Amino acid sequence: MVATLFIADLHLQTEEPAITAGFLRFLQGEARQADALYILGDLFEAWIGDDDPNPLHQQIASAIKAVVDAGVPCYFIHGNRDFLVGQRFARQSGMILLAEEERLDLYGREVLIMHGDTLCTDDQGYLAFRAKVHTPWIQRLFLALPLFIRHRIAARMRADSKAANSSKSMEIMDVNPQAVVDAMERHHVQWLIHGHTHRPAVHELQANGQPAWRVVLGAWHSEGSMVKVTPDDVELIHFPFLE
Ligand SMILES: CCCCCCCCCCC[C@@H](O)CC(=O)N[C@H]1[C@@H](OP(=O)(O)O)O[C@H](CO)[C@@H](O)[C@@H]1OC(=O)C[C@H](O)CCCCCCCCCCC
Ligand SMILES: [Ca+2]
Ligand SMILES: [Mn+2]
Ligand SMILES: [Mn+2]
Ligand SMILES: [Mn+2]
Ligand SMILES: [Mn+2]
Numbered sequence: 001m002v003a004t005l006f007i008a009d010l011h012l013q014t015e016e017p018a019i020t021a022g023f024l025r026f027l028q029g030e031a032r033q034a035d036a037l038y039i040l041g042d043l044f045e046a047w048i049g050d051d052d053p054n055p056l057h058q059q060i061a062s063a064i065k066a067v068v069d070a071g072v073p074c075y076f077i078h079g080n081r082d083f084l085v086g087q088r089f090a091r092q093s094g095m096i097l098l099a100e101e102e103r104l105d106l107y108g109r110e111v112l113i114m115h116g117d118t119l120c121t122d123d124q125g126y127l128a129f130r131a132k133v134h135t136p137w138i139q140r141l142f143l144a145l146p147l148f149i150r151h152r153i154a155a156r157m158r159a160d161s162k163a164a165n166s167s168k169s170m171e172i173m174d175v176n177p178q179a180v181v182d183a184m185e186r187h188h189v190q191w192l193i194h195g196h197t198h199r200p201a202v203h204e205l206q207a208n209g210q211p212a213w214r215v216v217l218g219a220w221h222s223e224g225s226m227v228k229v230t231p232d233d234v235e236l237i238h239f240p241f242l243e
Contacts, residue, residue: 001033004106006227007194008040009219011081011171014056019220024053026224027063032070039095040195040217041115043081043233046158047148049102049143050088061093068094077102079115083134084143086196103187107231112187116194116216121179125164179212181207191234193217193227200236225239 012020031037043060068074076087076095090097100118104111120126132138142150165173175197184192189204193215200218204211214237218225228235 002028002107003034003228003230004036004038005031005034005090006038006040006113006193006217006229008079008114008217009042009198011042011045011219012056012060013045018241020056022220022224023060023138024063025242027067032067033074034072037067037072037074039074039076040113041077042081042195043076043079044082046154047082047084047156048147048154049084050086052147057089058092061089065092066093071242077113077115080117084139087237102185103184103189106229109191109229110189111191111193111229112184112189114183114194116175116196119175119179119183119194120173121176123168126173133203177205183210184208191215200238202236216227
């Protein structure tokens with residue numbers, strides 16, 4: 001089919017087997033026919049390095065690679081949960097790693113894609129955390145630690161994140177509308193697709209002196225979510241995990 005697909009915020013983990021089964025079934029569906037599949041971050045609930053022997057990682061890598069081998073190029077933009085996904089997993093899965101912002105030409109429509117966390121520019125605490133965990137020497141230090149140490153550090157970060165999210169106001173954590181305009185005018189696009197916020201919606205705004213739209217993907221909780229771009233339209237689609 002002449003369509004390009006976008007998903008994000010699956011937060012896969014061995015403790016949520018139903019979501020994993022829904023993703024595996026999705027990879028065997030119309031996704032096998034798409035022009036391309038873009039995964040905009042937070043594919044996994046957490047990532048502590050490509051050397052993690054977590055069997056779910058190889059199961060997911062195998063299923064994506066079968067999609068790639070079937071002729072569907074697959075791309076990945078990092079999320080706040082899996083920014084440590086590296087070239088070893090890209091090779092294992094056949095995915096191509098992209099930068100934090102990418103501008104696509106989709107059947108004549110220019111579209112900006114990103115995970116979306118960098119649009120929450122009022123959360124100065126988060127952005128300070130993000131700058132640190134993206135520093136290469138700090139990443140290399142974390143990756144040199146034993147796996148059982150990395151698990152403990154990840155567990156503490158998750159605990160403190162859930163605490164800070166409960167003590168922070170939604171008005172300081174949500175997407176900043178001026179950061180959206182700035183990003184869409186930096187790339188001169190009228191269309192933007194992102195995830196992270198788990199609030200699937202289509203927001204109309206103004207950018208480049210024209211109407212513009214910000215499409216938000218949904219997290220995979222009870223059902224799946226995807227954006228489908230065709231030469232004719234942009235579709236936000238919700239579907240069950242199983243038939
Ligand atoms: C090189 C290091 C590698 C570490 C890899 C470990 C594996 C990855 C672990 C994932 C942690 C991630 O969840 C943190 C995060 O992203 N929080 C922001 C996010 O909230 P979520 O709970 O993730 O949905 O989205 C929310 C909305 O945007 C936002 O609010 C949250 O941001 C925060 O809550 C962060 C706080 O503001 C500041 C917390 C920093 C203090 C924690 C430091 C712990 C260091 C312990 C060292 C032993
Ligand atoms: Ca706000
Ligand atoms: Mn998410
Ligand atoms: Mn094809
Ligand atoms: Mn996120
Ligand atoms: Mn259709």
